[PDB]
């Protein structure tokens, strides 16, 4: 009904809102998210640190 007020008051679980809105509004199966979120490697620090530079440059350099 309001995908905004619900989004705001709870910034902590934006992950759940994203996944649910993937699940229902868009057409993807609630099975193909399950593996990819179960299959993930632990970012172990190293992976995470690199993706994070990566986002940082990319978002900043997109115009």
């Amino acid at each position: 009904a309001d995908p905004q007020l619900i989004a705001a008051l709870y910034p902590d679980q934006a992950e759940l809102f994203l996944t649910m809105d993937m699940m229902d509004k868009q057409g993807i199966d609630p099975q193909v998210i399950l593996d990819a979120d179960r299959l993930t490697v632990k970012r172990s620090k190293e992976q995470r640190f690199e993706d994070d530079k990566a986002f940082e440059s990319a978002l900043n350099a997109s115009k």
Partner: protein, 82 residues
């Protein structure tokens, strides 16, 4: 039930003197700190931990200086720069 306590030492309940802080440096340990620490500012920060001893604080204040210049820089600068 409350029963007013009437005592408070801002130094036992807030800042508690920790082991590493409040240690005057032994005249020999300065020689180790000057050679095996890249920047001495991180000898203070203690997330632990972390005794004993200075042979561990060196390993921590070096690894934290490595963890800093790898990412802290990118994240903060980028986020506030623009």
């Amino acid at each position: 039930a409350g029963r007013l306590d009437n005592g408070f030492d801002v130094f036992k309940d807030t800042i508690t003197p920790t082991r590493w802080n409040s240690h005057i440096w032994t005249p020999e340990e300065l020689e180790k700190i000057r050679t095996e620490v890249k920047n001495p500012a991180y000898i203070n920060v203690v997330t632990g931990g972390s005794p004993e001893n200075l042979d561990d604080l060196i390993k921590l204040a070096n690894e934290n200086f490595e963890n800093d210049s790898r990412a802290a820089e990118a994240g903060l600068g980028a986020k506030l720069s623009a």
